[PDB]
Amino acid sequence: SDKTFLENNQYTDEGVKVYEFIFGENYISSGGLEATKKILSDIELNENSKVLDIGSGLGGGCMYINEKYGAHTHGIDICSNIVNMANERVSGNNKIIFEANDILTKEFPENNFDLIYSRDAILHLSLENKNKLFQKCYKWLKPTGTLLITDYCATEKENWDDEFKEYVKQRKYTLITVEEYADILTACNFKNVVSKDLSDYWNQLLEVEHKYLHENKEEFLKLFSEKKFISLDDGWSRKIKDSKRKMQRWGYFKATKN
Numbered sequence: 001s002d003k004t005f006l007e008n009n010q011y012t013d014e015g016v017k018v019y020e021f022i023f024g025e026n027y028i029s030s031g032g033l034e035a036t037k038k039i040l041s042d043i044e045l046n047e048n049s050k051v052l053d054i055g056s057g058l059g060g061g062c063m064y065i066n067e068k069y070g071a072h073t074h075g076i077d078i079c080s081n082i083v084n085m086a087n088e089r090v091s092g093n094n095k096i097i098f099e100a101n102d103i104l105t106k107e108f109p110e111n112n113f114d115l116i117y118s119r120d121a122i123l124h125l126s127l128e129n130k131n132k133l134f135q136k137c138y139k140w141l142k143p144t145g146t147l148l149i150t151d152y153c154a155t156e157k158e159n160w161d162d163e164f165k166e167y168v169k170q171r172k173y174t175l176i177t178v179e180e181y182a183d184i185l186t187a188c189n190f191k192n193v194v195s196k197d198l199s200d201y202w203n204q205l206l207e208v209e210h211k212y213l214h215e216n217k218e219e220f221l222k223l224f225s226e227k228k229f230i231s232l233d234d235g236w237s238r239k240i241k242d243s244k245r246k247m248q249r250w251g252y253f254k255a256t257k258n
């Protein structure tokens with residue numbers, strides 16, 4: 001059911017291409033390549049490392065991790081159409097694998113990965129499933145491994161306004177506070193749990209993206225439609241407003257198995 005909802009609405013082929021337009025080639029989330037460089041700036045891996053990317057999208061993250069470190073990267077994404085697109089973006093590289101599957105039913109061996117990485121994907125999971133997923137991640141990490149996440153978070157639900165309630169409802173997101181998120185990781189026995197509210201940085205990424213959209217409107221209209229432009233424009237406007245006033249937050253989380 002989840003698969004069909006995502007494939008048929010938010011992540012249709014065209015929806016994915018619209019995201020790629022504003023985020024940059026191979027990315028469909030916040031800050032594209034430049035944010036990825038920053039998020040991985042203190043991460044150490046090498047050609048012998050094994051990495052899992054949960055919700056791998058068009059595969060940009062896997063491509064970058066493999067380029068930077070030479071690591072084995074395995075991306076899982078529930079949307080078959082997105083995985084098909086990702087597979088067209090990489091060739092002749094036996095250390096990048098993209099696989100269409102629900103991360104919640106996927107099986108991996110215990111103590112398997114040096115890094116489990118996820119960028120703006122876990123918002124799609126119910127609270128019960130976030131907990132289940134992080135339990136799986138704990139098992140799947142090597143003793144020496146690291147968990148590294150960015151995800152959409154929010155102020156406490158009691159504070160939400162009508163527009164924000166509707167945004168979350170229509171997308172079927174489950175947005176929790178940065179603090180609740182960190183508490184889940186702690187409950188799952190992760191160590192050295194570091195959470196950062198990166199909402200200010202996120203706001204900066206959004207502003208750069210918004211400016212890019214405006215300055216490249218003519219090309220956007222040629223590729224897509226004015227209707228799609230307006231939707232995207234308004235969507236970024238709201239994210240900028242809501243991040244500034246702390247209604248919507250961008251959470252970063254890093255933790256270790258030991």
Ligand SMILES: Nc1ncnc2c1ncn2[C@@H]1O[C@H](C[C@@H](N)CC[C@H](N)C(=O)O)[C@@H](O)[C@H]1O
Nearest residue numbers: 027028029055057077078079102103119121124
């Ligand atoms: N249960 C799930 N299992 C695997 N992938 C999922 C699941 N739920 C959502 N996704 C994927 O999570 C991705 C989230 C995207 N917002 C981001 C993709 C990618 N991480 C990027 O930064 O460009 C989508 O491509 C979804 O299809």
